[PDB]
Scaffold this active site. Structure first.
Site, mmCIF file in Angstrom:
data_model
loop_
_atom_site.group_PDB
_atom_site.id
_atom_site.type_symbol
_atom_site.label_atom_id
_atom_site.label_comp_id
_atom_site.label_asym_id
_atom_site.label_seq_id
_atom_site.Cartn_x
_atom_site.Cartn_y
_atom_site.Cartn_z
ATOM 1 N N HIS C 89 19.149 -3.903 46.475
ATOM 2 C CA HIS C 89 17.959 -3.200 45.995
ATOM 3 C C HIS C 89 17.786 -3.441 44.503
ATOM 4 O O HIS C 89 18.694 -3.898 43.836
ATOM 5 C CB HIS C 89 18.055 -1.695 46.273
ATOM 6 N N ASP C 92 11.078 -1.931 40.238
ATOM 7 C CA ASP C 92 9.959 -2.412 39.428
ATOM 8 C C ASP C 92 9.160 -1.154 39.027
ATOM 9 O O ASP C 92 8.703 -0.444 39.871
ATOM 10 C CB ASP C 92 9.110 -3.371 40.311
ATOM 11 N N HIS C 94 5.696 -0.064 37.380
ATOM 12 C CA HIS C 94 4.403 -0.517 36.910
ATOM 13 C C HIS C 94 4.103 -0.003 35.493
ATOM 14 O O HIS C 94 3.239 -0.562 34.814
ATOM 15 C CB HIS C 94 3.320 -0.051 37.839
ATOM 16 N N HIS C 129 8.561 0.879 42.652
ATOM 17 C CA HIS C 129 9.035 0.550 43.979
ATOM 18 C C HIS C 129 10.118 -0.507 43.903
ATOM 19 O O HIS C 129 10.276 -1.194 42.861
ATOM 20 C CB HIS C 129 7.874 0.094 44.858
ATOM 21 N N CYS C 130 10.864 -0.609 45.002
ATOM 22 C CA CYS C 130 11.845 -1.675 45.184
ATOM 23 C C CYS C 130 11.093 -2.987 45.332
ATOM 24 O O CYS C 130 9.988 -2.997 45.840
ATOM 25 C CB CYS C 130 12.698 -1.388 46.403
ATOM 26 N N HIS C 139 10.834 -3.630 52.063
ATOM 27 C CA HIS C 139 11.459 -2.509 51.336
ATOM 28 C C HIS C 139 10.447 -1.405 50.963
ATOM 29 O O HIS C 139 10.699 -0.189 51.166
ATOM 30 C CB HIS C 139 12.203 -3.011 50.079
ATOM 31 N N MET C 144 10.581 2.792 50.035
ATOM 32 C CA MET C 144 11.257 2.646 48.789
ATOM 33 C C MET C 144 10.261 2.546 47.614
ATOM 34 O O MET C 144 10.066 1.480 46.986
ATOM 35 C CB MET C 144 12.206 1.472 48.865
ATOM 36 N N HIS C 249 -8.971 13.538 49.809
ATOM 37 C CA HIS C 249 -10.032 14.522 49.866
ATOM 38 C C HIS C 249 -9.433 15.889 50.160
ATOM 39 O O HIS C 249 -8.599 16.029 51.058
ATOM 40 C CB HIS C 249 -11.030 14.146 50.974
ATOM 41 N N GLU C 273 -15.937 14.211 45.621
ATOM 42 C CA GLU C 273 -15.644 14.703 46.966
ATOM 43 C C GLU C 273 -14.382 13.975 47.483
ATOM 44 O O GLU C 273 -13.456 14.594 48.035
ATOM 45 C CB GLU C 273 -16.885 14.580 47.905
ATOM 46 N N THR C 274 -14.364 12.659 47.289
ATOM 47 C CA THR C 274 -13.335 11.764 47.770
ATOM 48 C C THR C 274 -13.184 10.674 46.696
ATOM 49 O O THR C 274 -14.153 10.342 46.015
ATOM 50 C CB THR C 274 -13.776 11.150 49.123
ATOM 51 N N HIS C 300 -9.255 10.356 53.750
ATOM 52 C CA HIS C 300 -10.535 10.537 54.429
ATOM 53 C C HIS C 300 -11.027 9.283 55.198
ATOM 54 O O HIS C 300 -12.212 9.131 55.479
ATOM 55 C CB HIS C 300 -11.611 11.127 53.494
HETATM 56 CU CU LIG Z 1 15.171 -1.763 48.320
HETATM 57 CU CU LIG Z 2 4.219 -3.380 42.392
HETATM 58 CU CU LIG Z 3 -14.823 15.425 55.424
#
Ligand SMILES: [Cu+2]
Ligand SMILES: [Cu+2]
Ligand SMILES: [Cu+2]
Ligand SMILES: [Cu+2]
Ligand SMILES: [Cu+2]
Ligand SMILES: [Cu+2]
EC number: 1.7.2.1
Lengths: 334, 334, 334
Positions: C89, C92, C94, C129-130, C139, C144, C249, C273-274, C300
């Protein structure tokens, strides 16, 4: 102030893609706006092949009608489920606050009715849809959705806060259908909604619509039912998708001002070629036509548009502007 | 003013991911900019397995070349369909106004050519693609798409309206292919486009691409064809998807300034990790590199990236900055 | 300034949807913030049917824990891969700059550990994430992944730059799983990860999740594990999806202020709303509750929500406001 002292206006709804008469700028104080909708379960032919589904509709159409009010009006909806229907229905307004958008308070069996009132506290275009507990996506994907527009009291404004006024308004409801398919790929047929249900669920779980249509059917907004405008006209297109992302595009035009997620307190996005309306959202785009002829208005996943049905047309009349586009040398052999 | 009194500049296009020379700030008045593209239908190997498709290209590449002009220039495109091709082609510019973006005026049979002119009235990056009536998604998903950048006359500006200047520019075209599969899941093979057509349509209707690639093939932007930069350099990446949503991400970096929907009158989004470019749109991201080494530039549906092909690399040279990142304790047993 | 002269704070992480204690406004100067995570590969039951997968987790949960720091702090992560695990493993971020977000420097075999440090130069919520080379999506789609929030030093601000203060914070991780299916549609079972791998890859290549869940399982955020609030409370919901687009939502509410793509230098979108969170992104939404009762918080795409699992609940206590919504005529026969 006490709600009983406010003016009341009754509105009779029109069939999409048309929109009931209203004022963009609020010509009265806050009002209670009364709407009535009658649920109708009916058979609908949705494609050129004649595929027929048991549709679930507000007021007989897919999508349901566009309701229009102003910020801080009250919406009072009388929802009628006649005895000729078979299923339980309700309504959730994304515009409303509380009780699952009204859904917890509007459960109507066939032969029953209900009246809900809510305050339209936020300006924007919003989805409404049926949401009966345990069966929500089946109702929504059978056509039971529409939109409501809550205009700011002083109308729409551009990115710098100056007035934008539309001359025409259209409402395009985009519907994803999931017609169950057998191992060979044919569309299955069913005797009752209850016999259809598990196969409806399995078809839905594919996440792959069999049909994506405007105004309830392949080609509903073409030919004699094409949207129209003239060169120079300012057109607002309200576009909703209750379940699935869409990406509208006017072939040959633009979205001059676009609220992609549909909420008017935000400044519009300018000069869009294509815009993303997330599933569960309504958006609005404003365009001033500059050229005549036929425009296609499509979901710009072009497979969704030209094979699955998510395409309509505008017929625009007026003067051709050679400055903006011209054929210098017409197609010919060399 | 009369168009014949304007300067004319001829541009010779380059193969993506590179971009023809131009000025960011307009060093002349409005011009007519002349481009020529030759349609080429050719076989293309698109993956490591050697899968070969009948591709449809502008100028021999997938994507087609990036055209660059300034706001209120005229684009004059001479489109040639040589007699060695089999199909009818045209072009739709999302940058243009009227006649289905030029598509209604550019229909060329093999052995024919045409010249279209249009005014680039809106600043932004825009998709162009083939759109022959009745067969639009098949052409688009066979590679027949590119982009055009219409720069503002005074170049790009940041969220507060101060100048942003790029040192390098790259164009990444992302292509979804739908190679037809049998019941066992193997890729089918076809003798002519017409025999391929219905199976192409059925594959498209799955809405599930078999391949998602940058610059026409799995691994086209890796190894010897890796994009390059130096620490401190300002890089603009223009990214288009004619048919399907994508979500670009620079592994190890950011989009410092991002026009996700690609239109330069809007302020950029700052500090993006990942951004959504809707199908039918082109976007642009500006990044200043701060660390050396290998970066992957991917569609951040990571299945789309690492299994279906939507991944390329940047090799960046320069000084490592231990302040920004360091290994304190290198991987070891305890 | 030299990093050794900065204060150090150790943080012990909590299980989602809860978030470790922190200050919104930075009450110290820039710090090195020390976190420890222990990788745990474990069996997890993910649905009501009892479907069991070999999950790959940071700290025993899906998603991994929300880490919280301030802009220009240093994050120092001690990552432990115990000998009881089988796979390699890494991590990373961001949020970080360089070396594939830390992934090139954090490769740990079972029985090994590593310590990475990076400067949190950009304010926002970010995915981590891995990402082990050659096996990234497997992964990530096995659980992960998590998120990190880098607050601006003076806290969150609204669209006009005035302070926004949350009273509670929740973290919802949305996970797409791709459990391999046979020709009949049953979920396959495997003896080791290596025997699972190719079938995992083929399931992933469908681009059709079998399960979409919040906090690692269907119904994890319901019932006794429902999120809670009171009327009048300001709640921030951080929502991440490492691989696939989602559209959150709040049924019965709104996103009053929304950073859909999660980066706090940008003004928030109002009254949503969304909202669309692209795959590979984390977003944040701020809502002030105005009504009591049960709210559903859903993806949604309602199929994704109610059939595949992407739905949780809020139980909200307080006063019912009849002004905002009321039943005028309760459901009854006529
Ligand atoms: Cu991993
Ligand atoms: Cu990424
Ligand atoms: Cu709705
Ligand atoms: Cu219903
Ligand atoms: Cu073509
Ligand atoms: Cu197009």
């Amino acid at each position: 102030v006490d709600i009983s002292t406010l003016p009341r206006v009754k509105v009779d709804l029109v069939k999409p893609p048309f929109v009931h008469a209203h004022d963009q700028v609020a010509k009265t104080g806050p009002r209670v706006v009364e709407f009535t909708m009658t649920i109708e379960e009916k058979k609908l032919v949705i494609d050129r092949e004649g595929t027929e589904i048991h549709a679930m509709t507000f007021n007989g159409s897919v999508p349901g009608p566009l309701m229009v009010v102003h910020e801080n009006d009250y919406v009072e909806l009388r929802l009628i489920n006649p005895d000729t229907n078979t299923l339980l229905h309700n309504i959730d307004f994304h515009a409303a606050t509380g009780a699952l958008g009204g859904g917890a308070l509007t459960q109507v069996n066939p032969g029953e009715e209900t009246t809900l009132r809510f305050k339209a506290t936020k300006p924007g275009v919003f989805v409404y849809h049926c949401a009966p507990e345990g069966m929500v996506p089946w109702h929504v994907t059978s056509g039971m959705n529409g939109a409501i527009m809550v205009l700011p009291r002083d109308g729409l404004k551009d990115e710098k806060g100056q007035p934008l006024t539309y001359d025409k308004i259209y409402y395009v409801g985009e519907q994803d259908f999931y017609v169950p398919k057998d191992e060979a790929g044919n569309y299955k047929k069913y005797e009752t909604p209850g016999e259809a249900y598990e196969d409806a669920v399995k078809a839905m779980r594919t996440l792959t619509p069999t049909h994506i249509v405007f105004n309830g059917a392949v080609g509903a907004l073409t030919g004699d039912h094409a949207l129209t405008a003239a060169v120079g006209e300012r057109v607002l297109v309200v576009h909703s998708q209750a379940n699935r992302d869409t990406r509208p595009h006017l072939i040959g035009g633009h979205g001059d001002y676009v609220w992609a997620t549909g909420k008017f307190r935000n400044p519009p996005d300018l000069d869009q070629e294509t815009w993303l309306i997330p599933g569960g959202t309504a958006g609005a785009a404003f365009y001033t036509f500059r050229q005549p002829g036929v425009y296609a208005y499509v979901n710009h996943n072009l497979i969704e548009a030209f094979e699955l049905g998510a395409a309509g047309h505008f017929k625009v009349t007026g003067e051709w502007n050679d400055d903006l586009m011209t054929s210098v040398v017409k197609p010919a052999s060399m």
